[PDB]
RNA sequence: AACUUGACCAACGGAACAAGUUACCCUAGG
RNA sequence: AAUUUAUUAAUGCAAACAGUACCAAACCUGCAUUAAA
RNA sequence: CCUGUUUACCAAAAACAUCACCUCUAGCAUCACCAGUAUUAGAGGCA
RNA sequence: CUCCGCAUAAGCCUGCGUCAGAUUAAAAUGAACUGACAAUUAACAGCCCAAUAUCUACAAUCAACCAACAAGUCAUUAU
RNA sequence: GCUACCUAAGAACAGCUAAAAGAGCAAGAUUUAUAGGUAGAGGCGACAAACCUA
RNA sequence: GCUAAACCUAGCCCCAAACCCACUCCACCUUACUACCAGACAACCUUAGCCAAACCAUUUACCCAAAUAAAGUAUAGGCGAUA
């Protein structure tokens, strides 16, 4: 079945993760002290971030799901 | 691993100095390829029975492929180490105690 | 600004999507294929080539109405806007096909060769041998991909072993399992081949400039 | 006009300014250490003197290593040394014929290593030389731990004797949790290479990664100056007292 | 032919250019859909003035006054004069604990305030 | 092994080993 | 025209790999062989 | 053997392009060809 | 005489406004050169928009009739 | 930012035969503004071996 | 008699010795010098041709830590040039 979106329109996957990552014990050393990228450390992995507070112009709605008024029963309007 | 040799010889150094190397200390001839030699077995003490040898404690000279990939991994054989070879001395010299 | 394929869309829909031109050049803006150049706008309509699409919460086979078959720019053949339950596509129009006309698309093997009606969408090896079919796919499930253009048909010489074995219209055998669907009938505007150009003129409306080897 | 120092020397004049110098002295030597990588690609010479053959006159005889040339990929893969050789040859191995470049990639595969002291499997890509050194080092977290540097060739093999050798100095339960009789056993094994933890963690890391850690640990808040000031104030009234 | 040396400003280039180069005013709102301006408040600076009324300090000083020494004020004359005496005090009657620096005007943190010396987050 | 031998290298004092074409021509002085 | 096949594709060998006497996946690397440009 | 660009221009001529015509290669999808599938696509010749 | 002209866009950046000049054009009033002073004021124009899902087969042409082909700039709802 | 080709989204074209629309006289294989792409071992070329800021 | 002529400083050069630089405020990687919104592009890979061989086809040079000497010696090289 012919799929809609060509790969190379849809986003790039994620760079491989830096080994040190996976040896147990090491926490690898990343450029988020120096707050800015750097090619020679690892890139962080950054926490979800949160704005803490309601601000309509940047406002992002809950899940469908979540919504108060979801059904499960479609009515077609 | 792809081994060579120099076409040109390099003038000494001398002692505690690195050789100056021009441009035709670049050009090689390629003296062997490690690759294309005979494959040597890999000696390995089995700690489990193997259709091949399965005397446990017995030194073997399996085929490097067939070592690697599935004794070492799996744990039916160890490494024929110096320190491995008298652990599995005594439990010979114990069975026949 | 580097290239960037217009084929972005990810969801499928029947409204004419906007689309760019490539002018015969890839994505690193030099020219690969000559001749390409110009023309009239043009919209793609999502061709759905996957006969045997059931909707999300139904399953099995289902009847599809003929609403209308019109011409379409990106193609030779033309094509059919079908409407099945509540969902809408776009289909490759047969031969004889028409607006009002039903058409069912099924993915069950009989004991038998079932009747064959041109329009619908059956397994190769339901099929009856020595028919014509048009919009095969070589894996089940994989969609249409070949006897697409229009007025080609190929024929379904025989079922050997649950294996169906047809002649694409270049007169070449090819050999599938007997679970790929299939349209019968021939592929509309079995008359593309008689056109005229007539005038240069023509040639560029339809997107192809001069090419001069040497 | 001259400069004062050698511009080949403008290097190790960093390492005495600033963050480098304030690094462990301990690790400043891993840097400042040449060693000579184990011959892979060429045939060193047996001795320090040959007899030639034309003249029949014994010469002093050097080895010259060949340049080898290590990709970004190599650093995440343990090659064990090997390299590609970027050099020149002469067609049909005649002086005469044109010289032609050359390039002779190493053979790459993809295994899987199980290293006990980190209890975890690694998929990483690997030359057959580097299978013939674990071999002959009796496993792989014998191969990383013994092996030096210059011989590893790889960032990520330098990485995992931090990991190991951390886990030594650390004396980690985190190994074999529910196994401690398993877990001192396998520490028992590997005793000999265990080094401080101080030492350990400094192990591997690029000058880079280096700074950049040592940054973090100098990294402070200024202390405020009421803080400071009062502990001055309350030593001068103390000593008034003491006094009176 | 392009002046290079010229400064930039959103007098040059075309209308688009124009309208997204300022001179420097500092944005007090934000735009909407059709383009409209909404205007906060808070982000118009307000003016802060005083009464003047009844106030002695004119723009110029009589020439007939005694010449002083410049001395630049530091943190730890600030101290001295501020916060010692306090101390010095309690220190006596033994109620002095380093506990309790924030009885003097110690601010552990500056979270909270509404001038906040560190970052500043107020006008001159 | 030695003693020795070998290019019609004939453009024959012999470059170890290489042609056409330019009326699209490029450079050089006479 | 001579020089060359570094280069690109094609094939062979070795390399890697597995299974029920005898054979096995392309890729990849090394070395050959004609071609291409 | 249709018309279109080209130097020239009243222009002629030739060249190129091109409708038609002819042979040649290709059984397939997620960056060109192409979101196309041999009544297709590309490469040539066409007096 | 009109060959244009006025405006916008683009470009340009104070480049015939006042005052003064010993500077300048063929021209010791003019001045586009020099010094000083002044000036173009937003309604036009630029500068836009909360999220998630969902919707969007029917050209334009006075769009009606008769037609086509090279198949087309123009749209949502739910919370 | 010239020019060649191309992409995106625009714009222009009186009358006359006027069925047919067409460089007919005087709506096209037309012209044109804007932004973008293709770069010298190359690009582009209805191919002059031309053009790619002389 | 005009046009002109004349000038002695500005600094500069080569060494020596010493290892240099730079956060008033504000602005500046977007169309730099633009107060204020969900990033994600990331660096590492033989210098080449050619001075010459009176052509050119292998072949010559530009760095790696002490002036001098060993020594233009050993040695390499169409064993030629030359190194
Ligand atoms: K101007
Ligand atoms: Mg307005």
Redesign the pocket.
Known sequence: ?????????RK?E??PLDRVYEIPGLEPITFAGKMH?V??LA??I?P????GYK???????P??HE???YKDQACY? | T?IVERW??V???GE?????????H??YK?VE?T??R??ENLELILTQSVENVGVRGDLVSVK???G???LLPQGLAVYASPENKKLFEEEKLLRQE | ???????????Y????????????????????????????????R??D?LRFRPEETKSGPFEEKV??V????????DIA?VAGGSR?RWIIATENMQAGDTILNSNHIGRMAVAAREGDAHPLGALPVGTLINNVE?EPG??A?????????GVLLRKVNGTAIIQ???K?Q?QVLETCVATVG??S??????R??????????????????? | ??????V?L?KR??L??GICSRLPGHYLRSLEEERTPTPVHYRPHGAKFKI?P??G?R?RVEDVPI?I?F??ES?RGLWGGEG?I???????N????????????????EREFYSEILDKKFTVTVT?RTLDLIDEAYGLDFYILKTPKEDLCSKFGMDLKRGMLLRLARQDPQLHPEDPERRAAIYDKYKEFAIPEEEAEWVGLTLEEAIEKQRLLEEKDPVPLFKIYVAELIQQLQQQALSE | ???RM????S????????????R?????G????????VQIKE?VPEFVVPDLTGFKLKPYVSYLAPESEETPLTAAQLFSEAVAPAIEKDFKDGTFDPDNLEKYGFEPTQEGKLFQLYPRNFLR
């Open positions: 079945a012919y799929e809609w979106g060509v790969r190379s329109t790039s994620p760079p990228f090619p020679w890139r962080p950054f979800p971030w949160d704005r601000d309509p112009r940047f406002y992002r709605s899940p469908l919504h108060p008024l309007i | 792809v040109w010889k003038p000494l150094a505690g100095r690195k050789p100056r190397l021009h441009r035709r670049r050009v390629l390829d690759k294309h005979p494959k490097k492929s067939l690697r990939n599935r | 600004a580097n290239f960037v394929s217009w084929k972005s869309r990810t969801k829909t029947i409204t004419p999507v906007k689309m760019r031109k490539s002018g015969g050049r890839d994505h690193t803006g030099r020219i690969r294929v000559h001749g390409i150049g110009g023309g009239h706008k043009q919209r793609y999502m061709i080539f609403i209308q019109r011409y379409d720019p990106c193609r030779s053949a806007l809408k070589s994989r969609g991909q070949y006897i697409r253009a229009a007025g080609t048909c694409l219209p270049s070449r090819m021939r592929v505007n079995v008359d593309h081949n008689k005229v150009i007539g005038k240069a003129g023509r040639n560029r409306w339809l997107g192809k400039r001069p090419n001069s080897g040497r | 006009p001259l400069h004062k120092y050698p080949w403008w004049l960093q005495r300014e030639n034309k003249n006159q010469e340049p040339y990709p970004p650093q590609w970027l050099g020149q040859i002469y067609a049909n005649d002086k005469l014929s044109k010289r032609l470049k050359k390039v002779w990639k190493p053979q790459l595969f057959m | 032919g392009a002046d010229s400064k930039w400003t007098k040059r280039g075309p209308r688009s250019f124009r309208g997204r180069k300022g420097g005013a500092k944005g007090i934000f735009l909407t859909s059709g383009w409209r301006f982000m």
